[PDB]
Design a binder for these strands. Structure first.
Ligand SMILES: [Mn+2]
Ligand SMILES: [Mn+2]
Length: 183
DNA sequence: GCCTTGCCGGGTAA
DNA sequence: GTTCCGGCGCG
DNA sequence: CGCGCCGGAACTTACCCGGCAAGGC
């Protein structure tokens, strides 16, 4: 499914570079936000927004894509209870992703939290449990890898992909024509 | 000698 | 990345 | 009166980048 592939790719960006927020305001007001942040205004308008719009359209979600200018980065934001629970639930059953979803989700996550030079192959995150899930998926794909505590200051773990499988990983996960192609 | 990777600090893009 | 602010609509 | 969609933007750090050097072959 095109929809499931795209969803999974977005979830990787969201988990990596944004978030899912259930906000409570005065007085009894609420808001449900789906967010991806990024330094480049173009990357958001030209690569991400179209992907999100499409999804919003397939799900018949009524909200709009807001792009907000912040002091340090741009924010792509969708305010929508439906979309919020769409992704929140998708995340809960992450261990049940098929292979299309695993591949897409890793692509998005790498685009968000990865070594973009590609000189090394690395994914940082404080959530070890999440990295271990990606570790198992990668192993099943024949991409060897390890997980260590990289940043002792803040508790950040890195998942190191072995250069031995550089080609396997790059051609298989990053350059996959089956899902949204990375930047 | 050349690569791979564990560990690290800088500071900004989250 | 996360969570405040002050708006608005709608049953 | 109770909630959920817009539009901003202040407020801290968790990411990414790139060096070093120990260890493998
Ligand atoms: Mn992150
Ligand atoms: Mn990023």
């Amino acid at each position: 499914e095109n929809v499931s592939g795209i969803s999974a790719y977005l979830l990787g960006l969201i988990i990596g570079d944004g978030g899912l927020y259930k906000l409570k305001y005065k007085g009894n007001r609420s808001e449900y936000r789906v967010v991806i942040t990024a330094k480049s205004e173009n990357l958001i308008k030209q690569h991400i927004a179209p992907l999100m719009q499409f999804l919003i359209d397939e799900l018949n979600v009524k909200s709009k894509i807001q792009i907000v200018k912040g002091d340090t980065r741009y924010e792509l934001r969708v305010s929508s209870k439906k979309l919020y629970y769409y992704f929140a639930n998708m995340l809960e059953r992450i261990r049940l992703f098929n292979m299309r979803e695993q591949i897409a989700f890793i692509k998005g996550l790498y685009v968000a939290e990865g070594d973009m030079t590609l000189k090394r192959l690395r994914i940082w995150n404080k959530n070890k449990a999440l990295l271990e899930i990606v570790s198992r998926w990668l192993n099943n794909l024949g991409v060897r890898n390890t997980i260590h505590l990289d940043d002792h200051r803040h508790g950040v773990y890195v998942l190191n992909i072995s250069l031995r499988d550089r080609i396997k990983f790059v051609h298989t996960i990053l350059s996959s024509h089956l899902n949204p192609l990375p930047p």
